[PDB]
């Protein structure tokens, strides 16, 4: 069921912006850990006296890392005379965000046909405005509305190099890392109450519910017309034996926010080999692998899609596998990206649904919860 009810034309995920206290160290760590190239900058060396922003790219994936300078550097400016390249930036908002939440995503940015129209229609349909539409160098238009917590949905549209005022970084510093990651597949929020969050976001976007197929989790996925923009949201289920990890998130994050980013790889094996080689030398750690029972139970479930060698290759890398009625999903989860048990990354590869590949092919791994319970108890034997 796809009513295709988008209230304005949405294209693809454009970028994800992290608000940091020091953009340099987070960007360099992520670049090495994920194999993403330094591709653009806006900072003191480009005349930005307001914020330091560094863009990493891998395929179509764009990660932006931004931190405030001392307000004193820009004390003489006013909004008409700002040197910030992202006009929505606010020193106080940024410092308040990072002291409240620590390292996390401030903006989920989607590209649209007309950012001013998208903002207007959104606000007309219940969206809480965050930053009004602003036209940068007559070329790009940016506007922001509240999504959940202190996370914003950022609309970007081009009349026709990331943003104006960003410079291409010198080749020297730019080193061509690549572990196979290619695009953002979905971005997931954690909220206290799923109902009101869904009503709000579906209300101002027109995104529809993506149909799916005791873990402390209720969730639903909002999707654009071609289901390439996927925004799942989770709520906790209280009273369970093991404490809901959504509830732990809300407590350590000081409320709602972005929980995980799913990054599509063109070869999840190459990606997981390359990231795991770097786990203990500055990269990212992965959640503990499932017990070998899990992989001894995979033949009965996906033996038609993956060979005995590829299923073996799953076991060494700790990859999980799930399956829709339309496709198959390979997935694995990092440990939290920073100090707090809040944001983490998911690496995924989807197989099936070739018409190009349709969005959400194979689902989001909801069955891997139940299979992860049956794994453990069956192994305990």
Ligand X SMILES: CCCSc1nnc2c(C(=O)Nc3nnnn3C)ccc(C(F)(F)F)n12
SS3 381: coil
SS3 161: coil
Instruction: Please select the residue that binds a copy of itself; options are 160, 281, 354, 355, rule is CB under 8 A.
Output: 281
Discontinuities in the chain with C to N beyond 2.5 Å fall right after 160, 213, 355
Does position 28 interact with a copy of itself (CB under 8 A)? The reply is: yes
Task: Give the total of residues touching a copy of itself (CB under 8 A).
Answer: 48
Name residues contacting Co ion, limited to 339-368 (CB under 5 A): 346, 364
Q: Are 70 and 102 in contact (CB under 8 A)?
A: no
- Cα separation, 117 vs 277, in Å, equals 46
Interacting stretch for Co ion, rule CB under 5 A, among 41-49, 55-63, 208-216, 261-269?
261-269
Residue with tokens 């926010």: 257
SS3 118: helix
Nearer to ligand X, 87 or 338 (CB): 338
Does position 297 interact with a copy of itself (CB under 8 A)? The reply is: no
**Minimum CB–partner distance for residue 79 and ligand X (Å):** 35
Nearest to 20 by CA among 49, 52, 47: 52
Q: Which of a copy of itself, Co ion, ligand X, none has residue 98 at its interface (CB below 5 to 8 Å by kind)?
A: a copy of itself
Query: Does 77 show up as a binding residue in the annotation?
Result: no
Run of H or E residues at 345: strand 344-352
Instruction: Please select the residue that binds a copy of itself; options are 2, 4, 5, 24, rule is CB under 8 A.
Output: 24
Q: Which of a copy of itself, Co ion, ligand X, none has residue 307 at its interface (CB below 5 to 8 Å by kind)?
A: none
- The alpha carbon of residue 21 and the mean position of all alpha carbons in its chain are separated, in whole angstroms, by 19
Does position 262 interact with Co ion (CB under 5 A)? The reply is: yes
Residues making contact with ligand X (CB under 6 A): 186, 188, 219, 221, 232, 234, 245, 287, 320, 333, 344, 346, 364-365, 368-369, 372
Does position 32 interact with a copy of itself (CB under 8 A)? The reply is: yes
Does position 31 interact with a copy of itself (CB under 8 A)? The reply is: yes
R_g of the chain, CA atoms, integer Å: 21
Nearer to a copy of itself, 17 or 111 (CB): 17
Run of H or E residues at 101: helix 91-101
SS3 helix, strand, coil % of the chain, rounded to 5? 30, 35, 40
Nearest to 365 by CA among 228, 221, 237: 221
Binding site for a copy of itself (CB under 8 A): 20-26, 28-33, 38, 43-44, 52, 67, 69-70, 72-73, 95, 98-100, 102-103, 172-175, 177, 251-254, 279-283, 285, 337-341
List residues forming the annotated binding site for Fe cation. 186, 260, 346
């Amino acid at each position: 069921k796809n009513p295709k009810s988008d209230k304005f034309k949405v294209k693809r995920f454009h970028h994800i912006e992290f608000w940091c206290g020091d953009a340099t160290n987070v960007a360099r760590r992520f670049s090495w850990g994920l194999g993403m190239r330094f591709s653009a900058k806006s900072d003191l060396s480009t005349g930005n006296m307001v914020h330091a922003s560094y863009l990493l790219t891998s395929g179509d994936l764009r990660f932006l890392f931004t931190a405030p300078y001392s307000p004193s550097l820009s004390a003489g400016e006013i909004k008409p005379t700002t040197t910030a390249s992202i006009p929505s930036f606010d020193h106080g908002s940024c410092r308040s965000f990072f002291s409240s939440h620590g390292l996390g995503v401030r903006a989920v940015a989607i590209e649209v046909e007309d950012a001013e129209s998208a903002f207007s229609i959104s606000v007309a349909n219940g969206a809480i405005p965050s930053s009004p539409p602003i036209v940068l160098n007559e070329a790009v238009t940016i506007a922001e509305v509240k999504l959940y917590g202190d996370v914003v949905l950022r609309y970007v549209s081009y009349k026709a190099e990331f943003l104006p005022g960003f410079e291409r970084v010198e080749d020297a510093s730019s080193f061509p890392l690549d572990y196979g990651i290619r695009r953002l597949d979905h971005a997931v929020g954690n909220v206290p109450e799923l109902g009101p969050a869904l009503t709000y976001v579906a209300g101002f976007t027109g995104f529809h519910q993506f149909a799916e197929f005791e873990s402390g989790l209720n969730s639903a996925v909002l999707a654009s017309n071609d289901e390439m923009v996927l925004l799942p949201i989770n709520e906790p289920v209280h009273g369970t034996k093991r404490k809901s990890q959504i509830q732990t998130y809300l407590e350590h994050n000081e409320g709602a926010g972005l929980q995980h980013l799913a990054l599509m790889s063109e070869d999840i094996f190459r990606t997981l080999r390359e990231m795991r080689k770097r786990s203990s030398i500055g990269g990212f750690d992965f959640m503990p692998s499932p017990p070998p029972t899990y992989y001894q139970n995979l033949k009965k479930r996906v033996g038609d899609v993956l060979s005995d060698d590829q299923i073996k290759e799953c076991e060494e890398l700790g990859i999980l596998v799930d399956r829709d009625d339309q496709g198959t999903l390979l997935q694995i989860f990092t440990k939290p990206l920073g100090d707090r048990p809040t944001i983490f990354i998911e690496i995924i590869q989807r197989v099936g649904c070739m018409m190009y590949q349709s969005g959400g092919c194979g689902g989001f791994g909801k069955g891997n919860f139940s299979e992860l319970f049956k794994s453990i108890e069956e192994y305990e034997k």
